[PDB]
Amino acid sequence: VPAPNQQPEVFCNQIFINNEWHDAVSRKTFPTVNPSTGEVICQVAEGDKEDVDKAVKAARAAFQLGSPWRRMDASHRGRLLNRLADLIERDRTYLAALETLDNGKPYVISYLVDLDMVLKCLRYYAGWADKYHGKTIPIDGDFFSYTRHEPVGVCGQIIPWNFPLLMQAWKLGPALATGNVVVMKVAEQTPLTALYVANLIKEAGFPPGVVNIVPGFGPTAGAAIASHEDVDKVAFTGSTEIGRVIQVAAGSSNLKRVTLELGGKSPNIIMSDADMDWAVEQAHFALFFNQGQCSCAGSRTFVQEDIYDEFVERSVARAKSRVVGNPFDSKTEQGPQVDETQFKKILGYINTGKQEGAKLLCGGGIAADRGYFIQPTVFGDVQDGMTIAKEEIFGPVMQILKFKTIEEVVGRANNSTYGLAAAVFTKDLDKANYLSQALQAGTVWVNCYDVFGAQSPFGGYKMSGSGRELGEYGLQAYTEVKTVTVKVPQKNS
Amino acid sequence: QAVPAPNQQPEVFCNQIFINNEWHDAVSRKTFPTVNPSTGEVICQVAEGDKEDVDKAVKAARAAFQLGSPWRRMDASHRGRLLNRLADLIERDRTYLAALETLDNGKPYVISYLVDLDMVLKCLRYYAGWADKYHGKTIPIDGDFFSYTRHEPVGVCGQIIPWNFPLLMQAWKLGPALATGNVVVMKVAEQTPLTALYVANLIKEAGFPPGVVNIVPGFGPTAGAAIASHEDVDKVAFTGSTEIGRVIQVAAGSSNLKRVTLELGGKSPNIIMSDADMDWAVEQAHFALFFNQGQCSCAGSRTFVQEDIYDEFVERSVARAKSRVVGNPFDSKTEQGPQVDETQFKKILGYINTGKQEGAKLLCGGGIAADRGYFIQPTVFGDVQDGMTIAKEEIFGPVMQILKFKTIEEVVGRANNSTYGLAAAVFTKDLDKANYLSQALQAGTVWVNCYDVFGAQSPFGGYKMSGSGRELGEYGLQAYTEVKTVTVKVPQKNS
Amino acid sequence: QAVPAPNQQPEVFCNQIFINNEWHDAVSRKTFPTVNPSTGEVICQVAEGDKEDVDKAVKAARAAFQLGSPWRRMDASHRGRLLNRLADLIERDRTYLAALETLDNGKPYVISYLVDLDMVLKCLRYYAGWADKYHGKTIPIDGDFFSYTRHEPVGVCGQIIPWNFPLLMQAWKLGPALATGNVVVMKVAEQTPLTALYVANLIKEAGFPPGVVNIVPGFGPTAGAAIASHEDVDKVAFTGSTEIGRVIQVAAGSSNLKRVTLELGGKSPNIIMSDADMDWAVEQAHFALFFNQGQCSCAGSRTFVQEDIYDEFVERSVARAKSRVVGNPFDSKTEQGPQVDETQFKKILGYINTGKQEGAKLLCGGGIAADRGYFIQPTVFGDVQDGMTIAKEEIFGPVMQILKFKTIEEVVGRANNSTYGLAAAVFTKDLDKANYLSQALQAGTVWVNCYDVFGAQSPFGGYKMSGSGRELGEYGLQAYTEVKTVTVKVPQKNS
Amino acid sequence: VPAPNQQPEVFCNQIFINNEWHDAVSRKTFPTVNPSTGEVICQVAEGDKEDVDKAVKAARAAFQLGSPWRRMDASHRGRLLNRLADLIERDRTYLAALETLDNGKPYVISYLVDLDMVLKCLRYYAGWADKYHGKTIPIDGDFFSYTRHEPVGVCGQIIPWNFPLLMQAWKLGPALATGNVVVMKVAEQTPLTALYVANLIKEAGFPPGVVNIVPGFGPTAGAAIASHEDVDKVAFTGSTEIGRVIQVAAGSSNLKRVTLELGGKSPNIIMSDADMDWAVEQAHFALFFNQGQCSCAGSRTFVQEDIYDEFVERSVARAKSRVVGNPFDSKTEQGPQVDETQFKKILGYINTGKQEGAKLLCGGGIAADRGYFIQPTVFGDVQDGMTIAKEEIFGPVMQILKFKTIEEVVGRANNSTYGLAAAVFTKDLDKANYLSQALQAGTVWVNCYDVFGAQSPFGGYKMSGSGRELGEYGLQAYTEVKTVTVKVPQKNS
Ligand SMILES: NC(=O)c1ccc[n+]([C@@H]2O[C@H](COP(=O)([O-])OP(=O)(O)OC[C@H]3O[C@@H](n4cnc5c(N)ncnc54)[C@H](O)[C@@H]3O)[C@@H](O)[C@H]2O)c1
Ligand code: NA
Ligand code: NA
Ligand code: NA
Ligand code: NA
């Protein structure tokens, strides 16, 4: 890993519309903080409804029949996505450092995980741009019938702060591969890296108005997108509570199409025949990755009785060894939480765990006197009705639950309004097949956790959301299907 | 001609709530009348299902969907066999069901038999074939993993349908849902409950496990709303008005974030270029608008005609509308039966009044066609302009709007200047005009030299406020599929 | 148990050449006997089709395929309906056809009824569902063009099939060919012509247009060769021996470059790891080899067993083979009927003799089981080694080879050290062993903890000299599809 | 277009195996000629059976389970294809000049058409490498059944001289995208550009043995590949007569899988309502492109009676204007034919046309005293039984036939043992739909000709071959389908 610049310069802090940079109409700004220190990095333009309106107008113009973007060869959309990826790779060291600065995650992880996954996502989707065929369809009668896979049009895309660049890429790849135009609302905690990437979108040669980015708050700019009468589709990643708000805003306005990637309380099931230390280390990763700030987090670790004591002992030792510190130090495993709001809320959940009778095995408090650092925390003897067992914590707080039978753990795993992900650790073919079929989750990992690939789709069951991102499936939400049915003189096979 | 003679007074056998392969009164014991629109007389009372009935239906559907249940364990091919058996039973009872359809809805019996029932049979048979063919994927993910997707059912599917094509809308919903192994709670329209309840009896006869299909007749803001807001319904599919579409999507968001697909209203443009075949275009434009008493969101309700042929097109269209026979729908000479109910009757008369007052030229019809039932004269307005109410709002009756245009660029902009986008058509002999217009129109279906050409193979649904999602075709399965990725660590991935 | 009682002397109704929905003698007026293998007696004479008969059949098929013909114009969904009607007719006549199958081929009636006929019905019904679902594509080519593909039929398809599963091999061929709108000239095996000719009668009854399916019984180097070399056959599909596969592919190349798919021989490995469920593995290994009198290219004819369990596996396998009932195939207690003919009888006895002489341990059987018909004792060889003839060559009879191995790396190399590659299986409780072996084996089907699990949904066919192409599944349509790209200049391409 | 080097240096003239360069075992060589001058460019290693054997052994080793190529991520195969394309683009000016030197086609066309299409083909297929999914299949019973899309293994690929680099790319793109290994036999007339590209395959980082190239003759090296007992699959592009030989060699050996892209006598149908000058110019291109050396050539130009005289007059004027000359001169439209054999054979066909009663309207003779240049030749009043109407000429010899009705022209167009391509020129929707359905051809162009895209498949009906190249379809011939059917405890939907 190239040595980081621990104070990367910030070049882009405004609203991006028609490949130009704007202040907000109000000229208001908001601070973004470095969570390692609690100090302001810079001010950022505070986009609201009137800024969103400009962005939507720009997007709609760029989507007009006969525009450069509408007429461009699909293969050329792919070329432009590949060019974007090459520019990100050129600027990989900078972007990883800026990602760490704004978000808090370790720089080694920003570089080797986030930036790698961004490159792979964009390059994957570049390949789709000229391959998502419609159909020729052997309808009854003397007709030629076929489908066109058109773009849906103006796509509102609202993303969170936990993986700023990667969440941007998961949205832009499929939308652009299929010829949509975008109005993106980046998270107020972490706007900077996506704004830099907008500069690279301009540099790559995307036509103006194809990607517009409005930094600002959720109930102002975000809600303006979800409520807008000329936005055709919204994709939202965030909390389940806000997903409700989005779907109500869509239905209340123009019945735009909605996909949602929401919260989780994902069960990680360790059968007694698992490989012990692999299970312990994967369970540790499953929960603590990215400071616990993952909707995918394995935050109910179900451990079979016969291995429970050993598994717990090992898990506690591993949590106690996990290095919390400055995210630019290569020894650091865990940076701060993103902001003070999250910091306080996680400490609040920890206090609920103690009060409700879970066993605090390690951690439980603040880890530093500056920035938002929380000790890696492990609770044992967790039970299904506890707050920490039910609600998404989004911090470094692990729940270990004991179970006896496979039928029992299916029922407890599934007894959630969430269904984003799950995992099973076992050597047994039959247990793996049974559990992967039975679990009500959009991704089931077997003998692994948090294995993402641009090829394989991701998304929720139940209140974890609707639709899928990544893979071929990621294109469906960005496609408007048009049937053309043509009278012909004489149909033949 | 193969249309068998109808019973004009088909007996009603089924008029209750259908839950777990059982027939029940409403919890309240209330009933509501359904009326024969040809006479205004009550056919029979039907159980008035409400929230408590919907709750029982959802519990029965949930029980049928439990892991390990007969419906969950059944071979996909066997789901196909069940769909084909249901189709056979409907075919057995085709003459009866077509007559019952006409009795309760008002459409001509010949059309109930040759269109509605034929399309029901073809839709169920088409989807039977999908049951064991909607594959998931094996995916060559990076690293030492085997990754694949399972195409699972979503679960408990609430399905709310309108009165315009009672049996066909039932089949568009049941076919993909059942093919993919979902379970159903269906709320049929209060104006047309009877044929769908008969089909429930045939579902039971076919051997579908109890609870797989449940039907709750009742009103919209009671039973329909209870489905849309229910905390244990995983998915809702709604076909109806754009206005109630907004209610459904808000209910979904405000309750449990159930998945939502919508098939809503239209104001579809039918574009006649000056090189069209005139005779063919005139008759197809007539069909496009007047089919099913005008009660189709598909309807070609903005007939755009190029100025060089406009006068002749209008004269020929008026002639044809004057010749269109309004009558008892059991008479095979009848082309147009009554509108479905008194509310619709009055609304359409209201739109006709608006049309006259806002400056459209009334060229024929415009009034009541009979002193009993809900019959309206075929009505043609000429010199219609884009800003008129009758050019913007869906009338849902036998009221035709003819507009004049000059150029292709003009007519693309005018046709697309709507919040609706369900369908469109272009009539032209030219290859290049056909290709350009079919690309340019913002509509979910574009017909070329035809109109109202539906096939179970080809998807249908809206752009813009005409809805979200597609019915029919392979696409119709997407809304009923929950995709699960399974990603397995392996010892050594090889190609 | 739902197996209906058989007629042990089913009447033969159809014994001629089937062309254009007509029954004909051979041009030569020659006939050939088909024999009941249970008794060695002639059932009846069958018309002996040759080149001149094949020429008439091909002309009838070509006429049925002409542009504008009823079969070319027919709706794809209607091709589906015809396939479903044929299935219904076969189901109507299931008891008869299962008995006739057993009479002519020798397999147990219970298996003819519950396996062969069930699978025929499921195959035709599966493919009926594909008829209107094998979409071409709309393709976003560079430039101002609209490009798409049509999935057309190839045309006149020559289909040559063996005697081991007469009706099922007929259905594997007809299902995809007819679903995609091809026409067929089929050459059935001379040992088992009768059931396929009956099914021709049902094809006619179902309403397929004349000439769409034509059947020529006769010999291989006469009628079969005439099909493979014919200048007006567009495609041949052959299932049979690897040796005749080479003849077919050479004939195709030497005549008109017709398209060729082949389903050939096997020497499939069945690998029992030491953590297998022993009782289950023993019974499945027994089935794997002995199913259908050993007459299956699918057969698990190299049973590899890990050394820690080898002795017990062998003792239990011998016990089971000693218990396997050989008898009249109409007796429901019979597990093994006769071999199909005297040539096969002698060949298998020859392989048994080779096995003994080349050092394999004869553990049971090895001889003739009855003094009439072609019955062979279930035969088990232990301590089989890779270089033995009985470990390399396909025996096609009730002769089981058990080999010992130690390691996974070893058994992958040994299993793959064959020019065959049709199927394979692994028995293990471990996830990682199952995944690794399923990736590593060079076989078109790998079964895990099972054997001989066929479904119309899942493709089947060879690696290496076991053949080219796949039957069953969506994949089975590929060989019957001619892809046409249509690329149209348009005024202005938009996304 | 960058100015060409009219004498580019030749770096690579040997057999390429395991990313190394070898003489033939025999140490024999063969000359490759510059067809513009008839002079030898250089000697090339003359590969035969023993060289093929080495190549097949190298390919088989590279395909072993657990090899680098077998274990590489599919996405990484795509990266390597993209890297290959970038290296070709780096060396585009050189490769276009070498292509012209060896083959004869104009340098402007080598640069703007061949090299562009090579880049686009490789970049298209790079995108497929991680997207050609197998299936999960809802079989009856308590089983999990799925397909793996494996590679077929060792793929013999035999290509012609008419589009040397492009034919290489049409073969390598799909084979490598799907993880096969290759033994390629390049045409003896034009070996040089493909050998240079092998050097770029090494430079790109493909593992040794993944691509092996054996220059040499057809009945020696080509036949050795088609007959080889350890080649799993052969793809052959060439003449129909040799396609027969290939299929016989496959059936006579190991029953390898065979696809064939063979000859043509493609009908180009001009209806009376066509746009005249567009039809004339497209018909001219259709026949004369690439010195007539295209199996796709529109070599039966069917012209409706009412436009025949004008169409012919215009076609003759255009042929008389077509500039024959040095292919490095930017004014040159037509270079020489590839070799003396072709030169003589084309002159022989011209003499048959004269003798059988076709009307020679222009050309008909040699166009220069050095190199293999033939005048653009147009025959009128051609009839269906004439040699020039039936047989593939593969030179600048145009056939114009007159017809009256659409039913007549369908029957005459289809009355051929060839079926590679066809076209219709018309304004009429119904005529276009009828003819495109009725014509027995693998590609039907409407109001265009020779419109190729990597997205859209190409290949023959009848004796024009089997299988398709380009598009998703191009992957099918390179995929070995494996069904895995696994007993499970309890199947659920
Ligand atoms: N359908 C298509 O896509 C397509 C494309 C380009 C060219 N073509 C055909 O290209 C041909 C190329 O020129 P050609 O006339 O020299 O073709 P050809 O068939 O003689 O040669 C084609 C290739 O096959 C090799 N070959 C020749 N004899 C062989 C044999 N006995 N065994 C194995 N390989 C052998 C040649 O060396 C060369 O590499 C044209 O005749 C045309 O018919 C077809
Ligand atoms: Na920040
Ligand atoms: Na009614
Ligand atoms: Na027999
Ligand atoms: Na040369």
Short mmCIF file of C-alpha atoms in Angstrom, two decimals, chain B residues 67-297:
data_model
loop_
_atom_site.label_atom_id
_atom_site.label_comp_id
_atom_site.label_asym_id
_atom_site.label_seq_id
_atom_site.Cartn_x
_atom_site.Cartn_y
_atom_site.Cartn_z
CA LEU B 67 -41.47 -24.07 4.77
CA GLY B 68 -42.25 -27.77 4.37
CA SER B 69 -45.86 -27.24 3.37
CA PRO B 70 -47.40 -29.18 0.41
CA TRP B 71 -47.30 -26.02 -1.74
CA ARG B 72 -43.67 -25.21 -0.85
CA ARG B 73 -42.53 -28.82 -1.42
CA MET B 74 -44.48 -29.40 -4.65
CA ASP B 75 -42.42 -29.93 -7.81
CA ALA B 76 -42.37 -26.80 -10.01
CA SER B 77 -43.59 -28.97 -12.91
CA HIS B 78 -46.57 -29.99 -10.77
CA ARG B 79 -47.48 -26.33 -10.22
CA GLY B 80 -47.57 -26.27 -14.05
CA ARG B 81 -49.85 -29.31 -14.16
CA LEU B 82 -52.23 -27.59 -11.68
CA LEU B 83 -52.38 -24.44 -13.80
CA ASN B 84 -53.14 -26.58 -16.88
CA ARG B 85 -55.86 -28.44 -14.94
CA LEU B 86 -57.45 -25.14 -13.90
CA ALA B 87 -57.41 -24.07 -17.54
CA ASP B 88 -59.09 -27.35 -18.55
CA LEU B 89 -61.83 -26.78 -15.94
CA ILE B 90 -62.42 -23.21 -17.15
CA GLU B 91 -62.60 -24.56 -20.70
CA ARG B 92 -65.13 -27.18 -19.52
CA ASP B 93 -67.22 -24.36 -18.05
CA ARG B 94 -66.48 -21.78 -20.78
CA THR B 95 -70.03 -21.23 -21.98
CA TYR B 96 -71.29 -20.76 -18.43
CA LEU B 97 -68.49 -18.42 -17.42
CA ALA B 98 -68.78 -16.25 -20.53
CA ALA B 99 -72.52 -15.83 -19.87
CA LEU B 100 -71.93 -15.06 -16.16
CA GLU B 101 -69.24 -12.58 -17.19
CA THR B 102 -71.70 -10.78 -19.47
CA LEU B 103 -74.49 -10.88 -16.88
CA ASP B 104 -72.42 -9.15 -14.19
CA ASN B 105 -70.21 -6.85 -16.33
CA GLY B 106 -72.35 -6.03 -19.41
CA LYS B 107 -69.88 -6.84 -22.20
CA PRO B 108 -71.25 -8.72 -25.22
CA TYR B 109 -71.42 -12.49 -24.72
CA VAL B 110 -69.67 -13.15 -28.09
CA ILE B 111 -66.73 -11.09 -26.82
CA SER B 112 -66.81 -12.69 -23.34
CA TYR B 113 -66.57 -16.08 -25.12
CA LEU B 114 -64.16 -15.38 -27.96
CA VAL B 115 -61.90 -12.78 -26.31
CA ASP B 116 -62.10 -12.83 -22.48
CA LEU B 117 -62.33 -16.60 -21.95
CA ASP B 118 -59.92 -17.41 -24.81
CA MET B 119 -57.37 -15.06 -23.33
CA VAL B 120 -57.88 -16.48 -19.81
CA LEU B 121 -57.20 -19.97 -21.08
CA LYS B 122 -54.14 -18.83 -23.04
CA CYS B 123 -52.77 -16.87 -20.08
CA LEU B 124 -53.05 -19.75 -17.59
CA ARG B 125 -51.64 -22.21 -20.15
CA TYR B 126 -48.77 -19.87 -21.01
CA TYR B 127 -47.84 -19.45 -17.31
CA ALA B 128 -48.21 -23.20 -16.61
CA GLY B 129 -45.27 -23.57 -19.01
CA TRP B 130 -43.10 -21.11 -17.01
CA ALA B 131 -43.53 -22.93 -13.69
CA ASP B 132 -40.36 -25.02 -14.10
CA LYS B 133 -38.36 -22.77 -16.41
CA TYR B 134 -37.62 -19.48 -14.56
CA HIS B 135 -34.04 -20.39 -13.77
CA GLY B 136 -31.72 -18.73 -11.33
CA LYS B 137 -28.08 -18.39 -12.17
CA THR B 138 -24.65 -19.83 -11.46
CA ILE B 139 -22.34 -16.93 -11.26
CA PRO B 140 -18.55 -16.81 -11.78
CA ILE B 141 -17.76 -14.56 -8.81
CA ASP B 142 -14.17 -13.67 -7.97
CA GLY B 143 -12.29 -15.81 -5.45
CA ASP B 144 -12.60 -19.42 -4.26
CA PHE B 145 -16.41 -19.44 -4.09
CA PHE B 146 -19.40 -21.06 -5.77
CA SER B 147 -22.10 -18.36 -6.04
CA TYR B 148 -25.61 -18.92 -7.39
CA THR B 149 -29.09 -17.49 -7.17
CA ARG B 150 -32.30 -19.19 -6.19
CA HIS B 151 -35.52 -17.81 -7.66
CA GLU B 152 -37.85 -18.19 -4.66
CA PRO B 153 -41.44 -16.99 -4.32
CA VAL B 154 -41.95 -13.70 -2.54
CA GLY B 155 -44.70 -15.14 -0.30
CA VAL B 156 -48.14 -13.79 0.47
CA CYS B 157 -49.29 -11.71 -2.51
CA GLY B 158 -52.20 -9.32 -2.22
CA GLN B 159 -53.83 -8.90 -5.67
CA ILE B 160 -56.44 -6.14 -6.18
CA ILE B 161 -58.26 -6.09 -9.53
CA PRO B 162 -60.83 -4.01 -11.38
CA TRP B 163 -64.19 -4.75 -13.01
CA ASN B 164 -63.44 -4.11 -16.72
CA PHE B 165 -62.06 -7.61 -17.54
CA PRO B 166 -63.00 -9.58 -14.39
CA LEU B 167 -61.83 -13.04 -15.40
CA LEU B 168 -58.89 -11.90 -17.52
CA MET B 169 -57.51 -9.64 -14.78
CA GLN B 170 -57.84 -12.57 -12.36
CA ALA B 171 -55.81 -14.77 -14.74
CA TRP B 172 -53.11 -12.11 -15.37
CA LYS B 173 -52.57 -12.10 -11.56
CA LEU B 174 -52.91 -15.82 -10.75
CA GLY B 175 -50.87 -17.15 -13.66
CA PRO B 176 -47.41 -15.70 -12.73
CA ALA B 177 -48.04 -15.81 -8.98
CA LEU B 178 -48.91 -19.51 -8.94
CA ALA B 179 -46.33 -20.49 -11.58
CA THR B 180 -43.59 -19.19 -9.24
CA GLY B 181 -45.07 -20.76 -6.08
CA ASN B 182 -46.57 -17.77 -4.30
CA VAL B 183 -49.83 -17.68 -2.39
CA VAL B 184 -52.57 -15.21 -2.98
CA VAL B 185 -55.15 -13.01 -1.27
CA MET B 186 -57.24 -11.52 -4.06
CA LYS B 187 -59.74 -8.66 -3.77
CA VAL B 188 -62.12 -8.64 -6.72
CA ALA B 189 -64.10 -5.61 -7.84
CA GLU B 190 -67.43 -5.04 -6.06
CA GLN B 191 -69.17 -4.49 -9.43
CA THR B 192 -68.04 -7.86 -10.84
CA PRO B 193 -67.33 -10.42 -8.06
CA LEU B 194 -69.18 -13.45 -9.41
CA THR B 195 -67.00 -15.01 -12.13
CA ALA B 196 -63.85 -14.86 -10.00
CA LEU B 197 -65.63 -16.65 -7.13
CA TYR B 198 -66.73 -19.40 -9.52
CA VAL B 199 -63.11 -19.77 -10.61
CA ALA B 200 -62.18 -20.16 -6.91
CA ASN B 201 -64.43 -23.21 -6.91
CA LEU B 202 -62.52 -24.55 -9.91
CA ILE B 203 -59.16 -23.84 -8.15
CA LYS B 204 -60.38 -26.11 -5.38
CA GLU B 205 -61.59 -28.66 -7.96
CA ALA B 206 -58.19 -28.59 -9.73
CA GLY B 207 -56.44 -29.63 -6.50
CA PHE B 208 -54.54 -26.55 -5.43
CA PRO B 209 -53.64 -26.94 -1.72
CA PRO B 210 -55.95 -25.08 0.70
CA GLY B 211 -54.87 -21.50 1.36
CA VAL B 212 -52.86 -21.11 -1.86
CA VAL B 213 -55.61 -18.89 -3.35
CA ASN B 214 -58.02 -16.92 -1.17
CA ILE B 215 -60.61 -14.44 -2.53
CA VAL B 216 -62.22 -11.65 -0.51
CA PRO B 217 -65.07 -9.79 -2.29
CA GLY B 218 -65.87 -6.44 -0.77
CA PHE B 219 -65.23 -2.78 -1.15
CA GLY B 220 -62.01 -0.96 -1.96
CA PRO B 221 -61.37 1.25 1.10
CA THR B 222 -62.28 -1.62 3.41
CA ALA B 223 -61.00 -4.95 2.07
CA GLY B 224 -58.65 -3.51 -0.55
CA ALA B 225 -57.04 -1.11 1.95
CA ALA B 226 -56.73 -3.90 4.55
CA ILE B 227 -54.65 -5.90 2.04
CA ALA B 228 -52.44 -2.96 1.03
CA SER B 229 -51.75 -2.02 4.69
CA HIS B 230 -51.43 -5.56 6.02
CA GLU B 231 -48.31 -6.28 8.07
CA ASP B 232 -48.02 -9.90 6.86
CA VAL B 233 -48.55 -9.40 3.11
CA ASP B 234 -45.19 -9.51 1.32
CA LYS B 235 -46.24 -8.07 -2.06
CA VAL B 236 -49.19 -6.23 -3.55
CA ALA B 237 -50.12 -6.08 -7.24
CA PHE B 238 -52.83 -3.53 -8.08
CA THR B 239 -54.67 -2.79 -11.32
CA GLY B 240 -56.99 0.18 -11.28
CA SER B 241 -57.08 3.96 -11.28
CA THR B 242 -53.93 6.08 -11.04
CA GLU B 243 -55.52 7.81 -8.00
CA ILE B 244 -55.92 4.58 -6.02
CA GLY B 245 -52.45 3.50 -7.19
CA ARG B 246 -51.10 6.35 -5.06
CA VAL B 247 -53.11 5.09 -2.08
CA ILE B 248 -51.69 1.58 -2.51
CA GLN B 249 -48.05 2.72 -2.76
CA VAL B 250 -48.51 4.97 0.32
CA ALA B 251 -50.13 2.10 2.25
CA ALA B 252 -47.17 -0.19 1.36
CA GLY B 253 -44.66 2.38 2.56
CA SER B 254 -46.61 3.19 5.71
CA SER B 255 -46.98 -0.46 6.77
CA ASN B 256 -44.34 -3.14 6.12
CA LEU B 257 -42.58 -2.03 2.89
CA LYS B 258 -44.25 -4.78 0.92
CA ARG B 259 -43.23 -4.90 -2.75
CA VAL B 260 -45.59 -3.00 -5.08
CA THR B 261 -46.47 -3.28 -8.80
CA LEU B 262 -49.16 -1.13 -10.37
CA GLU B 263 -51.09 -1.17 -13.64
CA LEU B 264 -52.94 2.16 -13.80
CA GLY B 265 -54.75 4.54 -16.19
CA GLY B 266 -54.07 5.72 -19.70
CA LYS B 267 -54.72 8.35 -22.34
CA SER B 268 -53.13 6.46 -25.17
CA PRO B 269 -52.39 8.12 -28.54
CA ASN B 270 -53.27 6.37 -31.80
CA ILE B 271 -51.31 8.11 -34.59
CA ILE B 272 -52.54 7.87 -38.19
CA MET B 273 -49.92 9.00 -40.69
CA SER B 274 -51.03 10.18 -44.12
CA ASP B 275 -49.60 7.03 -45.81
CA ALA B 276 -51.72 4.71 -43.60
CA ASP B 277 -54.16 2.23 -45.15
CA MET B 278 -57.26 4.35 -44.54
CA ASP B 279 -59.96 1.67 -44.34
CA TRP B 280 -57.87 -0.44 -41.97
CA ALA B 281 -56.90 2.55 -39.82
CA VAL B 282 -60.49 3.73 -39.51
CA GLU B 283 -61.76 0.36 -38.32
CA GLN B 284 -58.80 -0.20 -36.00
CA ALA B 285 -59.19 3.30 -34.53
CA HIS B 286 -62.83 2.54 -33.90
CA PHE B 287 -61.95 -0.72 -32.14
CA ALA B 288 -59.08 1.00 -30.31
CA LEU B 289 -61.46 3.41 -28.61
CA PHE B 290 -64.79 1.61 -28.35
CA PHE B 291 -63.64 -1.92 -27.36
CA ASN B 292 -65.25 -3.06 -24.10
CA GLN B 293 -67.65 -0.08 -23.95
CA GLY B 294 -64.57 2.15 -23.86
CA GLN B 295 -63.63 0.57 -20.47
CA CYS B 296 -59.97 -0.12 -21.07
CA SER B 297 -56.99 1.79 -19.86
#
